[PDB]
Write a protein that binds this ligand. Structure first.
Ligand SMILES: CC1=C(/C=C/C(C)=C/C=C/C(C)=C/CO)C(C)(C)CCC1
Length: 175
């Protein structure tokens, strides 16, 4: 009875890039297939004078040889015909870290407390998603009141992703 087709999902109305700038702490995530950032994750968003949005990000990750390193990453965003939907190109400061190109959607935000992000890397023949990831971000690395926790859960049900996330530690391991 629920529609899980990716083309039917509602996104943030009248999205505002300049208002989204500044520091964002990751507090929970849903993982995709393969290598991915593990914990101690912080993001910094910026917008230039001509309207182009970009970001940096740091976090610990375990490489192919299980070595434990602090990764320093960089991303740039290209606008589309929906103001909340972007294309993101990304890479690292060290040459052995991963590079690529992903969809980046803002499902909802209030700019001053919380944000919900989503990416579908592959579509099924019937229009639902075959490989996805998602981040829950905070301005304040504290818990979220009861009423904001309830709005975050309603957005996780829209995405057909209820009960598939885990909490992330913050440890000092990276700078
Ligand atoms: C750049 C960037 C993002 C994605 C980063 C990812 C996808 C990194 C993967 C790193 C790996 C796998 C390193 C191992 O070689 C997010 C969405 C947080 C928003 C801020 C900018």
């Amino acid at each position: 009875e629920r529609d899980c087709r990716v083309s039917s999902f509602r996104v943030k109305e009248n999205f505002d890039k300049a208002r989204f700038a500044g520091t964002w702490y990751a507090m929970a995530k849903k993982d995709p297939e393969g290598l991915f950032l593990q914990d101690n994750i912080v993001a910094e968003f910026s917008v230039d004078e001509n309207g182009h949005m970009s970001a940096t990000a740091k976090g610990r990750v375990r490489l192919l040889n299980n070595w434990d390193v602090c990764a320093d990453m960089v991303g740039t965003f290209t606008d589309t015909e929906d103001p909340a939907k972007f294309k993101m190109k990304y890479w690292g400061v060290a040459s052995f870290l991963q590079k690529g190109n992903d969809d980046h959607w803002i499902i909802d935000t209030d700019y001053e407390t919380f944000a919900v992000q989503y990416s579908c890397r592959l579509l099924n023949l019937d229009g639902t998603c075959a490989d996805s990831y998602s981040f829950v971000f905070a301005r304040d690395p504290s818990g979220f009141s009861p009423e904001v926790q309830k709005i975050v859960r309603q957005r996780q049900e829209e995405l057909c992703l209820a009960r598939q996330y885990r909490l992330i530690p913050h440890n000092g391991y990276c700078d």
